[PDB]
Ligand binder design. Structure first.
Ligand SMILES: *[C@H](N[C@@H](CCC(=O)O)C(=O)O)c1c(COP(=O)(O)O)cnc(C)c1O
Ligand SMILES: *[C@H](N[C@@H](CCC(=O)O)C(=O)O)c1c(COP(=O)(O)O)cnc(C)c1O
Lengths: 386, 386
């Protein structure tokens, strides 16, 4: 009836695939490169680099920081994160030996709690990795006040908020790097795909290098990694300079991404209209609280949190929902801190408490928002959730 | 041109791509699952796990060893590798904090020098990662003799030797794990693609988990990682237990992969016919040494090494081969140890020396072999390399 996922494609995505077939160049090329230019232009960054998925976009984002001429991050370094996000926002911190400090979320915005942030910040903090949750941007104004010129890097996992903006700027472009995802279920889809954006050329060349074999084949003759490239191909083409990966996207995802980006503004427009109608139907709801928007959210989906002491039990709504053909799931993955089994591999600490994440973990659920008009579905959802 | 790589595709892989487009299901699924099954069966391994590339296959191979119930490896352990190979054979080792011990290669076979190895193996050696170079398998009988019952893990990077055999056993299936690549220029091509095979179910379950977010979704109800999966999918489907990645292959790659396996034997045969031909044409070549075969090479390509005391300058030969429109390159990456820049990041040492690797690095070169008859390129090559 009402799924969490619908297809974003049309004839056009298919044609783009044909175009690629007909070219007989399958691995990362023209399209991918064209696609990166469009992406950057699209969100207002100087550079964009396409990878195999948003997870690997997070991996290189952290990785790159260790290979700047003046390494910006080091093993043991303290990084702050919020307690609610996708797993692969965290894994990379572990794989790089960072010390992780979790902070609770604000139960209204579902983003990192600001007042906890303020106090959680110190002289030991090297970086802050924010996540724009469910399409909702962090209030970067306040985040910038809290950092206050200190050597603390700001990073964004924007895998759920493509299109969101805050004060006339695209989410994802506030940090030194911002990551995106074009996985099937996201604002657009290239089957799998992710992207890192940055206005830093140094970081930009490093990303080009660790994305594919740690080589220099995709570096420009004069570049910020090696500096000046020899002209002996026999030579230059087989020099390895950073311990990277092969996380190249396929040409086909680049081509398909070109088509989706064209459609994006409409997708976002439809999404917001549905959000507007949704909020109208659900405000002053007797036992559910909705997400409070910051800036202009790209409304990835619709979260609900059971009102305190309303005596409503999640299992029930859950049943209700499914019995009406409406799919739902926890919000993102609930409180990450409960995954104690993977947590045993981390060097981590919890600032103050994560009561909010905890409450969410037991009392929130989520239903999708899509790029097609869902007025009908919402009216029904509201009939079911009364 | 006498290109280094060729299309192994015909209307079939084109048809398979079609079928997946027809299914409208693009994310890792049944084709991939089907391919994994065909793959293990083809190479004679109990299990196979398909990943986004041979490089991420090597990464997961190392990563798995850390998450076994009783860790097979730990930070600081020593692992012995050969000095000639693709850079992604080495990175995982640095990324996981292993102590890398380089060993010289045998100048004839181009694989690890067996004498050096016996000597390089010590009480501290926990594992040995072999690479089967250019289609040619390592003498695993000699290798197993060296290990002789001790607790030393044998691994293989088989990304260049899909289809080689040794004692009628398939290469890639001697070590606790073996990696494969199905990248454009390799034996089979699924655009990008890699696989890991193993006979160990626990490692096998660990791979299924770390390939996709460290979740439990692709583990069987009763499994070696978590035991028994819960029935409440609301919880079970968002449980994270090991620090993995998103290195899932594409369904299209799974589908193209299945047609490729069907054609393998033929590829191998032709490639081997080409090689024989090349052999006697180059049999008594006055100034160039050719690669010594162990078992049945899959002849990924043909190496040439300017004889000791010949007065021949590598430069000419290339000049020469380039003027003739024959595509040429270094043997893999040459002496990997020449990359001092990336070496800065490793915790490593060198066994004795790697003079063979350096000789090859300065006097070695290589042209590609294909699955179409090339007697004519050959005759021509011979003529050019007089
Ligand atoms: C996307 N999270 C998805 C995971 C879907 C999947 O199987 O990949 C979800 O179900 O919520 C996401 C990522 C991962 O990007 P990727 O899916 O392209 O690997 C990273 N960060 C965030 C915050 C995120 O939502
Ligand atoms: C194959 N190496 C290829 C590299 C092709 C590429 O650019 O990806 C070559 O040109 O020699 C290879 C790999 C890399 O696996 P992948 O290419 O599927 O990521 C890893 N190990 C070895 C030994 C290898 O030959």
């Amino acid at each position: 009836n009402y799924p969490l996922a619908s297809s974003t494609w049309d004839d056009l995505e298919y044609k783009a695939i044909q175009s690629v077939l007909d070219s007989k160049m399958f691995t990362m090329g023209e399209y991918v490169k064209q696609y990166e230019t469009q992406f950057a232009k699209t969100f207002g960054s100087k550079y964009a680099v396409m990878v195999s998925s948003g997870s690997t976009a997070n991996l290189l984002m952290i990785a790159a920081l260790f290979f700047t001429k003046k390494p910006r991050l080091k093993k043991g370094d303290e990084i702050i994160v919020p307690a609610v996000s996708w797993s692969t926002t965290y894994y990379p911190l572990q794989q790089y030996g960072l010390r992780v400090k979790f902070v609770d979320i604000d139960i209204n915005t579902l983003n990192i709690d600001i007042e906890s942030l303020k106090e959680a910040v110190t002289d030991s903090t090297k970086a802050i990795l924010t996540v724009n949750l469910l399409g909702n941007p962090n209030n970067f104004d306040e985040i910038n006040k809290i950092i206050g010129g200190r050597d603390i890097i700001l990073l964004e996992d924007n895998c759920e908020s493509m299109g969101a903006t805050f004060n006339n700027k695209c989410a994802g472009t506030f940090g030194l790097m911002g990551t995106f995802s074009s996985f099937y279920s996201k604002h657009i889809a290239t089957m799998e795909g992710g992207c890192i954006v940055t206005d830093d050329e140094e970081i930009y060349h490093i990303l080009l290098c660790i994305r594919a074999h740690g080589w220099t084949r995709n570096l420009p003759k004069k570049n910020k990694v090696t500096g000046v490239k020899s002209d002996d191909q026999f030579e230059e083409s087989f020099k390895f300079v950073l311990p990277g990966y092969n996380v190249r996207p396929l040409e086909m995802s680049g081509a398909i991404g070109i088509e989706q980006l064209k459609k994006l503004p409409r997708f976002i427009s439809v999404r917001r209209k549905n959000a507007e109608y949704f909020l109208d139907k659900f405000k002053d709801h007797p036992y559910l609280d909705v997400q409070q928007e910051t800036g202009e959210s790209s409304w990835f989906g619709f979260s609900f949190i059971i009102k305190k002491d309303s005596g409503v039990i999640r299992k029930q709504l859950v049943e209700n929902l499914n019995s009406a053909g409406i799919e739902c799931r926890p919000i993102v993955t609930g409180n990450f801190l409960k995954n104690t089994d993977v947590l045993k591999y981390f060097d981590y600490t919890v600032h103050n408490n994560v009561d909010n994440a905890e409450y969410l973990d037991k009392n929130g659920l989520f239903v999708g928002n899509h790029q097609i008009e869902l007025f009908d579905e919402i009216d029904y959802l509201r009939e079911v959730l009364k």
